[PDB]
Design a protein around this ligand. Sequence first.
Ligand SMILES: OC[C@H]1O[C@@H](O[C@H]2[C@H](O)[C@@H](O)[C@H](O[C@H]3[C@H](O)[C@@H](O)[C@H](O[C@@H]4[C@@H](O)[C@H](O)O[C@H](CO)[C@H]4O)O[C@@H]3CO)O[C@@H]2CO)[C@H](O)[C@@H](O)[C@@H]1O
Ligand SMILES: OC[C@H]1O[C@@H](O[C@H]2[C@H](O)[C@@H](O)[C@H](O[C@H]3[C@H](O)[C@@H](O)[C@H](O[C@@H]4[C@@H](O)[C@H](O)O[C@H](CO)[C@H]4O)O[C@@H]3CO)O[C@@H]2CO)[C@H](O)[C@@H](O)[C@@H]1O
Ligand SMILES: OC[C@H]1O[C@@H](O[C@H]2[C@H](O)[C@@H](O)[C@H](O[C@H]3[C@H](O)[C@@H](O)[C@H](O[C@@H]4[C@@H](O)[C@H](O)O[C@H](CO)[C@H]4O)O[C@@H]3CO)O[C@@H]2CO)[C@H](O)[C@@H](O)[C@@H]1O
Ligand SMILES: [Cl-]
Ligand SMILES: [Cl-]
Ligand SMILES: [Cl-]
Ligand SMILES: [Mg+2]
Ligand SMILES: [Mg+2]
Ligand SMILES: [Mg+2]
Lengths: 336, 336, 336
Amino acid sequence: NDWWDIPYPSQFDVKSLKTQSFISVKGNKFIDDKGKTFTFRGVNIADTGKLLSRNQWQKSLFEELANNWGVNTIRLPIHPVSWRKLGPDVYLGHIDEAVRWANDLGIYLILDWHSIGYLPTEQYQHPMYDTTIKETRDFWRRITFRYQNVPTVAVYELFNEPTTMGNTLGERNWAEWKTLNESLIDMIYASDKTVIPLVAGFNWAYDLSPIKKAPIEREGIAYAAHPYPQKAKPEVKNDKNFFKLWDEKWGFAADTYPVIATQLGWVQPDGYGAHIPVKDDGSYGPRIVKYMQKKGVSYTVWVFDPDWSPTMINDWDFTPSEQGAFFKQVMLEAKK
Amino acid sequence: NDWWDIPYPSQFDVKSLKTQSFISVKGNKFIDDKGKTFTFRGVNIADTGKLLSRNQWQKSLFEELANNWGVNTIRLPIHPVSWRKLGPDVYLGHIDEAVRWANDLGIYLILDWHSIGYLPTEQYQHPMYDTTIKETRDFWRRITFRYQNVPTVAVYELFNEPTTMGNTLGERNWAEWKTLNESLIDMIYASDKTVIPLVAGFNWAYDLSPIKKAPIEREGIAYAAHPYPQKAKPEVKNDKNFFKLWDEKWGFAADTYPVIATQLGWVQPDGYGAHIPVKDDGSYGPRIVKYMQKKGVSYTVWVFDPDWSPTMINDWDFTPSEQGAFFKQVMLEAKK
Amino acid sequence: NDWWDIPYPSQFDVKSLKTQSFISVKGNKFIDDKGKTFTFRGVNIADTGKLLSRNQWQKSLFEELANNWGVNTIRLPIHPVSWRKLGPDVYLGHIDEAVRWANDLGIYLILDWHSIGYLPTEQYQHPMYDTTIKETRDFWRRITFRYQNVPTVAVYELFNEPTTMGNTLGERNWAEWKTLNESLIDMIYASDKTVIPLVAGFNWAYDLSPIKKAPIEREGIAYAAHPYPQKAKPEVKNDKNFFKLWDEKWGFAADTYPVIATQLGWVQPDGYGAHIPVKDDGSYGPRIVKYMQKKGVSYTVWVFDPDWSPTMINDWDFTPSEQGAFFKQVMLEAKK
Ligand SMILES: OC[C@H]1O[C@@H](O[C@H]2[C@H](O)[C@@H](O)[C@H](O[C@H]3[C@H](O)[C@@H](O)[C@H](O[C@@H]4[C@@H](O)[C@H](O)O[C@H](CO)[C@H]4O)O[C@@H]3CO)O[C@@H]2CO)[C@H](O)[C@@H](O)[C@@H]1O
Ligand SMILES: OC[C@H]1O[C@@H](O[C@H]2[C@H](O)[C@@H](O)[C@H](O[C@H]3[C@H](O)[C@@H](O)[C@H](O[C@@H]4[C@@H](O)[C@H](O)O[C@H](CO)[C@H]4O)O[C@@H]3CO)O[C@@H]2CO)[C@H](O)[C@@H](O)[C@@H]1O
Ligand SMILES: OC[C@H]1O[C@@H](O[C@H]2[C@H](O)[C@@H](O)[C@H](O[C@H]3[C@H](O)[C@@H](O)[C@H](O[C@@H]4[C@@H](O)[C@H](O)O[C@H](CO)[C@H]4O)O[C@@H]3CO)O[C@@H]2CO)[C@H](O)[C@@H](O)[C@@H]1O
Ligand SMILES: [Cl-]
Ligand SMILES: [Cl-]
Ligand SMILES: [Cl-]
Ligand SMILES: [Mg+2]
Ligand SMILES: [Mg+2]
Ligand SMILES: [Mg+2]
């Protein structure tokens, strides 16, 4: 009742972590603080609240991924509805757990403010993604204060998937989106300059082409890409044609800035949760991996969860799905 | 609890309706899809929630109006407080009923986002009208998706009565209001181009004069006018002087665009719920009807309800008030 | 349940007050309506809700201050969280009490919308200060309507302490802040032109220097200053060096506009609730009083409360603290 006695917030205790290299941006590459080139390779897990509700928010989950799936990175898709439902204090307390778990395993976290829609008009694809510019700023303000100087938390992915859904949500306007990302980056850098902001384009974070002429005017950032199989639609389906289309919309970015494909994956058109744009016969797997390997692109596969699709696992015993078995071997081999 | 299992929305089933002409804008006229000039002539009823609370939300209400009062149109004043109180899903479910009822009777609906105040500062005449730009956009987003390709729903009246109340609510600024209406129209047209947006001026939707120099830069729209009796204040009260004042503030619009007088009416200064600007000795009735007839102006009288004033009916047996008996005969004669 | 029956608001009954001079702005001075120069000299009390919760919201509080502490002014720091918690109707009802109490004692009130942070991004120092541009406008709309033509309520302090906290809350931008204050002033002046708006600069209302080149372009306003002891940091601590630094950041304003130091005070570095920027050995007391006396600056000391620091009183028997005993004698002597 005494609102005047509500405490000011505290910061994560960095002394509680074991030594872990910071990742930073240098030119078009990530590097660690030993100066070695670094690639994020890993997976999304589900929202923290979804996992808690079925008692699957456990260090054992992180251990499975680190020990058996070859990941060096986990992306946490923090859904605004879940952020509100647990409330900031409880959600941050669970993020703290993820930090300790990842640190102990020597892996890194991408914190993703997981909305879909058009923030400047505050209209979204679905209520679970609902937010405001105010809440979005406040999220990043809180996150940046709490995890200041924490090497485990490497990337702040400002807004998962910008889209206006054919301008039903507003008029897509690069200049206003650019300005807003720059505004968020400024709040972040005022609080912690050691973190990597990740910025996305339109068409559900597929289209980075506006940065050819109007890149975000801030240093030390990276760009997101979500190159699902059906985003590029060549008439003739082969490596060369897909590569050219990917080149044009997002791959070119990797020549100048670091790029993380923070969502990618596929399921068979008749498989579990099959929907546009994730339907593929499986030929996309080797093709996107080859493409990313050639361009030095980082990635986190969607999704290491048995309910949300396309799945990497069919159950909580971690039985691999088609894409799961494929990416697991890719990541194990890369780790070598 | 599982927010991730909350369904995506569905659209009204157009196959459930009987054949009904679409109304569209051509130049300064409405026409039906047989190419014949069309005039909206009808009434407002109360907010859906008010009617539900006294069990008056019934097809019989629509039947009374269509069969005995000669209407071809009903305006639904959706109050934002009621929208929130029933919640979108339940409110839309009742709008669905209105659509089926009106369609069956061969009449049309105007959906009116019924707020009073200044949306750009989000300040209003009364809490019952309280909203935000975000909620207003979301309302129109939901409405346009749900009633796509539904002929019965003819007009989307974006914001009932713009006013700053002597600039106590903000600084009235045509350019910012124009831009915001254009933004809403763009969201709507991205989703359904077969609907007619209705745009209002300041001074409680009385003053359209800014469109002489700066009309909304979008095709297929109409303009609202609320010419209550005491809005124009000639020193000498006659046809000629009122006509000239109406000409100057709103009637001129009918020369170039279609105009719907979506609110109009009167009660005696000593009658039920008498207040500025609806007080009149009754001479306004024939005068506004003559004026509208000469200019081909569409109209929906306020209000076909026994509680809200000025009333068209004194009870739920539909006993006519003074203005009610007057307008009933006007509409019956026009229908012939 | 019947939202349509929710009453429109009413105004404070001015006939309930005894005769009391209006205070107005003339050049760089306040004057009363007898044309005599006037200086606000008094204190802050705690938020109305805090006082109510411990049964300390009583006329006896105002009587103690007027009769024994020599005040002619009390500042009410209305915290947005408390505004929401009591709700506008109940909070305004208690403000009405303060008005009657102050009027009877011949003292004046400053109503302070008591937030800390950056309103244009709606990010704040602490949740208790949380608000929006919409809520802030609505507060001033309600206040200005209710207390129209009430001499007892002299000053509307638009936003207590603007700060971006090292730009962690947003990018401080004088031009956008200026525009927003002008917008609030316009809402206020549209409703009551007899009230004095009080505008603040950045750095927790310490830095008025932007008004040298870009003052608020409205007449009849005053400027706030919060010159706590540790805001100016001269290497050599004496009258001359502090005076020069105060001159440069806020004191210059008093040459052209009226200035009210609506928060000021100190506690010993080892005293109760000691924190930056209010720690001082006590030499600040005579120095700030001398400075303000020379420049004709008005002031309300923070704070006449035994819980909130720095205190003027150590208990509810009004036992004076160090700064309390000091300021009490200053105010008693000035009153003579
Ligand atoms: O968050 C929990 C939820 O996630 C679900 O997956 C999401 C997925 O994360 C998201 O990327 C995906 O977005 C797609 C849209 O749904 C889809 O409409 C859109 O299609 C467009 C077409 O409309 C357009 O014509 O063409 C392009 C290219 O073909 C296409 O993108 O594509 C985007 C992605 O780019 O939405 C998913 C949900 O539908 C999980 O499936 C679910 O289990 C979880 O609850
Ligand atoms: O929504 C449920 C509610 O509706 C009530 O009627 C409303 C009516 O719909 C609305 O148009 C009307 O607005 C008027 C303002 O109330 C009135 O103040 C304003 O007056 C101005 C003057 O202030 C100005 O000086 O001059 C002009 C011209 O004379 C004048 O307009 O006029 C507007 C309309 O233009 O408000 C009504 C409520 O007061 C029902 O009466 C009620 O039963 C329902 O609950
Ligand atoms: O509202 C109830 C609450 O009030 C508490 O006092 C507030 C006080 O009213 C407010 O002015 C004060 O603001 C100070 C900030 O807290 C402080 O961080 C800031 O420091 C900056 C430094 O960060 C900067 O480096 O330098 C400058 C100059 O030295 C300095 O200002 O200073 C501002 C004031 O200018 O915050 C108090 C709370 O911390 C009561 O103490 C409490 O009991 C009540 O509950
Ligand atoms: Cl898009
Ligand atoms: Cl107006
Ligand atoms: Cl500041
Ligand atoms: Mg970090
Ligand atoms: Mg339609
Ligand atoms: Mg006053």
